[PDB]
DNA sequence: CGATCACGGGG
DNA sequence: GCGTACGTGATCG
C-alpha cells in the first residue's frame, strides 16, 4: 500500500505458504498477507517433448508426496543469449529442496536454475518490492545482559544477573540483587527480571532491537535461561519467541515484526580494529574512553555482594553506548538494504559479495535474465586454485610521514568503458571487441554487458544524487542523500572483488584479470607521477598505495599529496577517481595486506599481523604488542629484537608466570565426534573421564608441558597445573608461540626467526 | 603432506 | 529455510 517495508517472511497455514510483509505506515505497524505467490525453479530441457516425463517427477516431504503443480514454457536470456526454459511450479518452498535433485538427475534435463533463492527474497524480487523506502521514522531500543561466569563453564550454566536497555528516555538496569542507583530496578529473581525485559520490549514496541553480539551471546543466553526457568519470551510482534538461525559456524537471531540489529557484524565490516570489543569500537567512533568490567570482576561482585554499583554502571553504559552506536550505524545499513532490495536483518549480516549478488538477482528478474547457479564444491575449489597473471614486495624498514592513497573508485569505470562482463567475454561472431592488455581476454562491444549496464546506471544515479545535494537547502534531505550516494559507492566498488569471489553466480576470473590489467595502466601512471614529484612508493596493491617524500617535513608531504590527488583527477577521464585516504606518523610493510602504521594522534593501525585471540598465549600476544610499540611508538626495531631475546631467555629459565602460558580452545561437538584429537580435546576427554559434563561451547584452558611427542599428549588442564610439580614446555612457548607472533613483523627489518635469540 | 579444527564478539 | 560465514593459520594423523 503506502508504508515502508522493514521485513518479509512466510508462514505455513493448512500446509500452504503465506507471505508476510512487515510494514510501518505513519507510525503504525501493519502486516500484509499474500497467499497467491507460488514457488518455482527452471529446467532447461533437451527438447520440448521431454516436459511430459519431467512434469510427472515426484518427491516426498512431511509424509506426503510432492508434485510439480504447473509447468510453463518461458523465453529468457542466459549469458546474453535467448533461451527457452520450463518454469516448474511447486506448492510449498520446502518442496524445492525435496524435488530439485530428482529433476536435475533426469536424462532429458540439461540443467536446473534459481533453485536456492529463499521464498521471502524470491517474493521481494518478483513483486518489485524494496525495503526501507520513504521518510518513515523507526523506533529503536538497545538491549544487553550481564551474567555470572566462571572459567570453562558450559554456556548458560550461570544466571543472568542484570538486563539493561536504553533508548532516548535513558539507560536502565534490571537486577535481582539490591543496588541503590537511580537507573536500577530491583526485582525478586532471575525469572522476574527476564519477565520485566519482556514487558519493556512489549510496551516500548521498538521497530529495531539493537545489541552488541546479541546473535551469539545476549539472545542465545536469554533463550537458554528462559528454557531452564520454563518461561516464554514473546518478543515477536506475533508473540513468537526470538529465533536462532544457524548462519555458518555461528548464530543469527531474528525477532518477527522487528529488526534485530546486531552491531557486531556491521562494525566489523565498516572499520578496521585489531579487536572489536564494545569499548574499542565506542572509542574509535566517538573518541571517548569506556571502562571494561571483566567477567571475573562481575562474578566476584555478585557472589560477595561488594562493589555491585560498579557492575550496574558497566551494564548501564553497555546499553547506553549500544543505543548510541545503533543510531550512528543504522542509516547506512538502511540505505544499503534499499539499494540491494533486501531487509536490513539480512543486509546487515552480509558481505559486500552477497550485497552485489542480491542486487544482481533482482536486476536479472527485471531484465528477464536467467541467473547462473552458485558453484558446486568441486567448482568452488577449482576457483580458489585459479592463478591470476599480473603489485611488488614492499620497501623494507621503518618509514616516517606516510600518505595513504586509495584506487578503488577507478575499477567501476574500467568495467563500464571496456564492457567487462561474463556475457561479453570471448563471444563468437563478435564484430568489435576490446582486448585486455597482457592477458588478452576479448570483450564484445556489440551490446552492453549485463554488469557494465547496471554499473553505468549506478554511477549515473550517484552523480544525480550528488547534483541534487549541491542544489538542496534542506539539511535533512542532504543528510539522507549523502547516505544514498555512499551506499552506491560501496556497492559499485564491490563489483571488481565480486568478479573473483569464488561463491559468485556471475563469477568471472577473466573479468577480474582484465579489470586488473586495465587498472594497472592507471596505477603505473599514478606511481610514475608520484616518483617524478619526489615521492617514494613504499607499498602498492590493487586497492591503494602508501608513499612518503624521504626526509621531508610532514606538512609538506600532506600538502604535496593533496595537490597531487587534485592534479591526477584533473588528468583522469570520466568518473576515474583517486582518493587521499590518510596520513601516518610512521609505518612498516611486511607483504600484501600485512603492515602496521601509527597516526599523528598515536593510534596503531595494522592489517594482517595482530594476534588478539584466546587460542594464543598471553606471553605471545604481550610480546607482539611490545614489539609493535617499540617499533611504532619508539621508532626502535633494536628495542623490539631485544624484547624478543629477553622473553625467550626468561621462558628458557622458567621465569615467565604460568598464567601467561594458558591456551584456550572451545569444544564444538560431542567428544566422540572428533576425527583429530588436539591438546584441548585430549584435556577435555580426561575432564569427562573425571565426571565433568563436557559440552559444545565449553572453553578448555591448558598449558603445554615439557616432554616427548605431540603436544596433545603433554597438555594439562589449567585447573590441574601445579607450579611446584609441572614444568611447562619452554621450546614450545618459544618456537610455536612467541617467535611466530613476532617473526613476520621483524622480517620487514631483515631479521630471520634464528636472529631473535641470545 | 592432506585433513582437520580453531579464532572473532559476549559474561 | 529455495539456507547454514570467512579467511587464515596451527596441529593431527
Ligand atoms: Mg528473515
Ligand atoms: Mg553488557
Give domain limits for chain A: 1-133+351-371, 134-350, 372-448+502-586, 449-501, 587-758
Burial class (CB in 10 A: 0-12, 13-18, 19+), A55: middle
Integer angstrom CA distances of residue A413 from A410, A591, A700? 6, 28, 51
Q: Other C-beta atoms within 10 Å of A686: how many?
A: 15
**Cell 535533512 belongs to residue:** A476
CATH classification code of A372-448+502-586: 3.90.1600.10
Which of the nucleotides lies closest to A665 (Cα–C1')? B6
How many A from CA of A145 to the centre of ligand 2?
5
- CA A186 to CA A174: how far, in whole Å? 6
Residue A612 (CA) to nucleotide C5 (C1'), in angstroms, measures 20
Closest residue (Cα, C1') to C11: A678
The phi and psi torsions of A286 (rounded to 5 degrees) equal -100, 0
A9: nt with nearest C1' to CA: C1
Nucleotides on chain B within 7 angstroms of protein Cβ: 2-11
Q: Per residue in A180-209, is it b (16+ CB within 10 Å) or e — as a string?
A: eeebbebbeebbebbbbbbebbeeeebbbb
The answer to whether the beta carbons of residues A193 and A144 sit under 8 Å apart is no
Task: Report CA(A314)–ligand 2 centroid distance (Å).
Answer: 7
Please name the nucleotide lying closest to A121, CA to C1'. C2
Which ranges of A341-437 would DSSP assign to H, the alpha helix? Answer: 344-348, 352-366, 377-384, 411-417
d(CA A504, CA A526): 31
Which ligand sits nearest to residue A348's alpha carbon?
A: 1
The radius of gyration of chain A's CA atoms, rounded to the nearest angstrom, is: 29
Bases of chain C below 7 A from a protein C-beta are 1-7, 9-13
A118 Cα to the center of ligand 2, angstroms: 34
Task: Report the nucleotide nearest the CA of residue A211, measured to C1'.
Answer: B10
- Which of A502, A283, A541, A524 is CA-nearest to residue A404? A541
Q: Smallest Cα–C1' distance to nucleotide C13: which residue has it?
A: A676
Q: Answer yes or no: are the C-beta atoms of A283 and A275 closer than 8 Å.
A: no
Task: Tell me the CA distances in angstroms from A208 to A90, A256, A323, one per residue in order.
Answer: 34, 11, 10
Its sign, for the CA torsion A398, A600, A522, A485, is positive
Distance between CA A418 and CA A434 in Å, rounded?
6
* CA distances to A82, A183, A292, A514 from A169, in Å: 59, 11, 24, 55
Tracing cell 517427477 back to the chain, one arrives at: A57
Smallest Cα–Cα separation from A436: which of A510, A544, A509? A510
Report whether A618 contacts A660 (CB < 8 A): yes
Q: Closest CA to C2 C1' — which residue? A: A116
For the stretch A718-741, what's the b/e string if a residue is b when 16 or more beta carbons lie within 10 angstroms of its beta carbon?
beebeeeeeebbbebbbebbbbeb
Distance A244 CA to ligand 1 centre (A): 11
Which of the nucleotides lies closest to A122 (Cα–C1')? Answer: C2
DSSP string, A177-229: S----TTEEE-SSHHHHHHHHHHHHHHH--SEEEESSIIIIIHHHHHHHHHHT
Query: In chain A, what's the furthest Cα-to-Cα distance?
Result: 83
Which residue is nearest to the C1' sugar atom of B4, using CA? A676
Closest CA to A205 of A5, A24, A475, A395: A24
User: Is the CB of A227 less than 7 A from some atom of nucleic acid strand B?
Assistant: no
User: Phi and psi dihedrals of A342, rounded to 5?
Assistant: -140, 155
CATH topology for the A449-501 domain: Helix Hairpins (1.10.287)
Q: How many angstroms separate the alpha carbon of residue A211 from the centre of ligand 2? A: 9
β-pairing, A259-262 vs A208-211, is: parallel
CB A527 within 8 A of CB A568: no
- The answer for residues whose C-beta is within 8 angstroms of residue A45's C-beta and 6 or more apart is A51, A54, A85, A86, A108, A109, A110
Buried b (16+ CB within 10 A) or exposed e, A254-288: bbbbbbbbbbbbbbeebeebbebebbbbbbeeeee
The whole-angstrom separation of Cα A643 and Cα A558 is 34
Nucleotide nearest to A126 (CA to C1'): C2
Tell me the torsion sign for CA atoms A187, A324, A270, A589: negative
Give chain A's length.
Answer: 758
Q: How far is the CA of A325 from the centre of ligand 2 (A)?
A: 14
A678 touches strand B (CB under 7 A): yes
Q: Please choose, from the candidates A599, A547, A604, the residue with its C-alpha nearest in 3D space to the C-alpha of residue A578.
A: A547
Task: Please report the DSSP string for A6-25 in residue order.
Answer: EEEEEEEETTEEEEEEEEEE
Contact, A7 CB vs strand B, < 7 Å: no
Domains A1-133+351-371 and A449-501 share a fold: no
Measuring CA to CA, how many Å separate A219 from each of A223, A255, A480?
Answer: 6, 10, 32
Ligand positioned closest to the Cα atom of A319: 2
A239 touches strand B (CB under 7 A): no
Q: Which CATH class is domain A1-133+351-371?
A: alpha beta
CB burial of residue A650 (10 Å; 0-12, 13-18, 19+): middle
Q: Cell numbers at residue A385, please?
A: 586454485
Method by which this entry was solved: X-ray
Q: Any idea of the CA torsion for A719, A721, A723, A728, to the nearest 10 degrees?
A: -140
User: Apex CA A37: angle with CA A44 and CA A81, to 5°?
Assistant: 30
Supply the CATH classification number for the domain A134-350. 3.30.420.10
Does the C-beta of A272 come within 7 A of strand B?
no
- List the grid coordinates of A708: 616427548
State whether residue A625 is helix, strand or coil: helix
Amino acid at each position: 500500500h503506502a508504508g515502508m517495508i522493514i521485513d518479509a517472511d512466510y508462514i505455513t497455514e493448512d500446509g500452504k505458504p503465506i507471505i508476510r510483509i512487515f510494514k510501518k505506515e505513519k507510525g503504525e505497524f501493519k502486516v500484509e498477507y499474500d497467499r497467491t505467490f507460488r514457488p518455482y525453479i527452471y529446467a532447461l530441457l533437451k527438447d520440448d517433448s521431454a516436459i511430459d516425463e519431467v512434469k510427472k517427477i515426484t518427491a516426498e516431504r512431511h509424509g506426503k508426496i510432492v508434485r510439480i503443480t504447473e509447468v510453463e514454457k518461458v523465453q529468457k536470456k542466459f549469458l546474453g543469449r535467448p533461451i527457452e526454459v520450463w518454469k516448474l511450479y511447486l506448492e510449498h518452498p520446502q518442496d524445492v529442496p525435496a524435488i530439485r535433485e530428482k529433476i536435475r538427475e533426469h536424462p532429458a534435463v540439461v540443467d536446473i536454475f534459481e533453485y536456492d533463492i529463499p521464498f521471502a527474497k524470491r517474493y521481494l524480487i518478483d513483486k518489485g518490492l524494496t525495503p526501507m523506502e520513504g521518510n518513515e521514522e523507526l523506533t529503536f531500543l538497545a538491549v544487553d545482559i550481564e551474567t555470572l561466569y566462571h572459567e570453562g563453564e558450559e554456556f548458560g550454566k550461570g544466571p543472568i544477573i542484570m538486563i539493561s536497555y536504553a533508548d532516548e528516555e535513558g539507560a536502565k538496569v534490571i537486577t535481582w540483587k539490591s543496588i541503590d542507583l537511580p537507573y536500577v530496578e530491583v526485582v525478586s529473581s532471575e525469572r522476574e527480571m527476564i519477565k520485566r525485559l519482556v514487558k519493556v520490549i512489549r510496551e516500548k514496541d521498538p521497530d529495531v532491537i539493537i545489541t552488541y553480539n546479541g546473535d551469539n551471546f545476549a539472545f542465545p543466553y536469554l533463550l537458554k535461561r528462559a528454557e531452564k526457568l520454563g518461561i516464554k519470551l514473546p518478543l515477536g510482534r506475533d508473540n513468537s519467541e526470538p529465533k536462532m538461525q544457524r548462519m555458518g559456524d555461528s548464530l543469527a537471531v531474528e525477532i518477527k515484526g522487528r529488526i534485530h540489529f546486531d552491531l557486531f557484524p556491521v562494525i566489523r565490516r565498516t572499520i578496521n580494529l585489531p579487536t572489536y570489543t564494545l569499548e574499542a569500537v565506542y572509542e574509535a567512533i566517538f573518541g571517548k574512553s569506556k571502562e571494561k568490567v571483566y567477567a571475573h570482576e562481575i562474578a566476584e561482585a555478585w557472589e560477595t555482594g561488594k562493589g555491585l554499583e560498579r557492575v550496574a554502571k558497566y551494564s548501564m553504559e553497555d546499553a547506553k553506548v549500544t543505543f548510541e552506536l545503533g543510531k550512528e550505524f543504522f542509516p547506512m545499513e538502511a540505505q544499503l538494504a534499499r539499494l540491494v532490495g533486501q531487509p536490513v536483518w539480512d543486509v546487515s549480516r552480509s558481505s559486500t559479495g552477497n550485497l552485489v549478488e542480491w542486487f544482481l538477482l533482482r536486476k536479472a528478474y527485471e531484465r528477464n535474465e536467467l541467473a547462473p547457479n552458485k558453484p558446486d564444491e568441486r567448482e568452488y575449489e577449482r576457483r580458489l586454485r585459479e592463478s591470476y597473471e599480473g603489485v611488488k614486495e614492499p620497501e623494507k624498514g621503518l618509514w616516517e610521514g606516510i600518505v595513504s592513497l586509495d584506487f578503488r573508485s577507478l575499477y567501476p569505470s574500467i568495467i563500464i568503458t571496456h564492457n567487462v562482463s561474463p556475457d561479453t567475454l570471448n563471444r563468437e561472431n563478435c564484430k568489435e571487441y576490446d582486448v585486455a592488455p597482457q592477458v588478452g581476454h576479448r570483450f564484445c562491444k556489440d551490446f552492453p554487458g549485463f554488469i557494465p549496464s547496471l554499473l553505468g546506471n549506478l554511477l549515473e544515479e550517484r552523480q544525480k544524487i550528488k547534483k541534487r545535494m549541491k542544489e538542496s537547502k534542506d539539511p535533512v534531505e542532504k543528510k539522507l542523500l549523502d547516505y544514498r550516494q555512499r551506499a552506491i559507492k560501496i556497492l559499485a566498488n564491490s563489483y571488481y572483488g565480486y568478479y573473483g569471489y569464488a561463491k559468485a553466480r556471475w563469477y568471472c576470473k577473466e573479468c577480474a584479470e582484465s579489470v586488473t590489467a586495465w587498472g594497472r595502466q592507471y596505477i603505473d601512471l599514478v606511481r610514475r607521477e608520484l616518483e617524478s614529484r619526489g615521492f617514494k612508493v613504499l607499498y602498492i596493491d590493487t586497492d591503494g598505495l602508501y608513499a612518503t617524500i624521504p626526509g621531508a617535513k610532514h606538512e609538506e608531504i600532506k600538502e604535496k599529496a593533496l595537490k597531487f590527488v587534485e592534479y591526477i583527477n584533473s588528468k583522469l577521464p570520466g568518473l576515474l577517481e583517486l582518493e587521499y585516504e590518510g596520513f601516518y606518523a610512521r609505518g612498516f610493510f611486511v607483504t600484501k595486506k600485512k603492515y602496521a602504521l601509527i597516526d599523528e594522534e598515536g593510534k596503531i593501525v595494522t592489517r594482517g599481523l595482530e594476534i588478539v585471540r584466546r587460542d594464543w598465549s598471553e606471553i605471545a600476544k604481550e610480546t607482539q604488542a611490545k614489539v609493535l610499540e617499540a617499533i611504532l611508538k619508539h621508532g626502535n626495531v633494536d628495542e623490539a629484537v631485544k624484547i624478543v631475546k629477553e622473553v625467550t631467555e626468561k621462558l628458557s629459565k622458567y621465569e615467565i608466570p604460568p598464567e601467561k602460558l594458558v591456551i584456550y580452545e572451545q569444544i564444538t561437538r560431542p567428544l566422540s565426534e572428533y576425527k583429530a584429537i588436539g591438546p584441548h580435546v585430549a584435556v577435555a576427554k580426561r575432564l569427562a573421564a573425571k565426571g565433568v559434563k563436557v559440552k559444545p561451547g565449553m572453553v578448555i584452558g591448558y598449558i603445554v608441558l615439557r616432554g616427548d611427542g605431540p603436544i596433545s599428549k603433554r597438555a594439562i588442564a589449567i585447573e590441574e597445573f601445579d607450579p611446584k610439580k609441572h614444568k611447562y614446555d619452554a621450546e614450545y612457548y618459544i618456537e610455536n608461540q612467541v617467535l611466530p607472533a613476532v617473526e613476520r613483523i621483524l622480517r620487514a627489518f631483515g631479521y630471520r626467526k634464528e636472529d631473535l635469540k641470545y
